[PDB]
């Protein structure tokens, strides 16, 4: 009669109005047919070589693209009319100021959580025409870093480039994955992967999750910075091809949506299990000092024991209790709110290992080109 409105109601969205179409059955109407044609015409190797040259937001598209793709890209690179440059700048500055926390949350928190999102785990696991498993999951764990880049939407930055290339990658995947019998057979009846709804689930595992955890830890998030961070994520969802009718307009909307669309779908899968082990291995192999028990303990603290158990993160009760008691003290100290706290030495070691992890994930994604898959 008049209590919970549908989570996909356009009423709580950036568009604010619209017809009301279930995003489970919406993909990318503009990109999908273009990428299907590019792949079917055998144009992927040439297109990748042309697009390798397109690296900065203010750059003209390389000459020589197929006309349909050129037209798509010229449209896709446009910022929405509701993008606010000042807020975008503020959100980028906030992300940098709080970089150890955001970077740790994206890399460990959202990256490990992704192995409990069955559709994302299955798509990544079964995708064939890009790079190897190890490279793929490392790139999955780095989602958030490009969006949160300090220069993301400036003329010399690259997030428009990254967003447009990602939109094209996803569109290619939608043409490719249904041709994989292992993907089709495990898809639970979804005919085409990476629906709008699926993108928004993943978005909640990033934006909404990171904000929640920063606030819980006592990071100083004033209202204006919270709003600017949301704005970065809203504009980025649009540039990835999410219709404005599905992007939450406010934190209240986003927080309520995450509870309904992300929390209930988290599940262990065989594919996700494989990916968790690969990611845990990748992180432990970095020159960061993140040992398996530190990763486990900090990730369980970050995700909670229910999700940690679902993923299979081994129990570290001594370190988890040390972290729960003292990590908020380290945060308060770094926020300038308390004098230097007497905490166990391993807290400072953990903090340094997280800082080196974040720097390594900043270093690695610098300059890597996003290629369209084929085959
Ligand atoms: C906010 C949401 C998302 C972001 C920011 C995002 C980002 C990206 C990026 C940057 C790439 C390019 C990887 C690279 O080559 O460097 C990519 C590729 C891919 N994405 Fe997403 N994605 C999102 C949602 C999804 C969802 C919901 C799915 C699946 C249900 C998905 C499945 C994939 C697949 C399968 C690839 C190709 C991987 C490969 O073969 O290398 N993505 N995505």
Author numbering: 29 to 403
Can you list sentences taken from the study reporting this PDB entry?
While screening for appropriate crystallisation conditions, diffracting crystals of LcpK30 were also obtained in an imidazole-containing buffer, and a structure of LcpK30 in these crystals was determined to 1.48 Å resolution. These crystals belonged to the same space group (P1), albeit with slightly altered unit cell axes, again with two subunits per asymmetric unit. Most features of LcpK30 remained unchanged in this structure, including the positioning of the proximal axial ligand, His198, towards the haem moiety. However, remarkable differences were found for the distal haem ligand Lys167 and for Thr168. Both residues were shifted significantly, releasing the coordinative bond to the metal ion and breaking the secondary structure of helix E into two shorter helices connected by a loop. Concomitantly, the C-terminal helix Z5 was split into two parts connected by a short loop, helix Z6 rearranged towards the active site and the distal axial position at the haem iron was now occupied by an imidazole molecule from the crystallisation buffer. This structure showed an increased accessibility of the haem group, opening a direct access pathway to a cavity at the distal side of the haem group, and in spite of the presence of imidazole we suggest this to represent an open form of LcpK30. The observation of two similar conformations that differ in the nature of the distal haem ligands confirms a flexibility of the Lcp structure at the distal haem site and suggests that Lcp is a member of the hexa-coordinate haemoglobin subfamily that can switch between a hexa- and penta-coordinated form. The imidazole-bound Lcp could thus represent the structure of the otherwise penta-coordinated form that is able to bind dioxygen. The transition of LcpK30 to the open state generates a distinct, hydrophobic access channel that crosses the entire protein molecule leading past the active site haem group and exiting on the distal side. A single charged residue, Glu148, is located within this channel, at a distance of approximately 6 Å from the iron ion of the haem group.
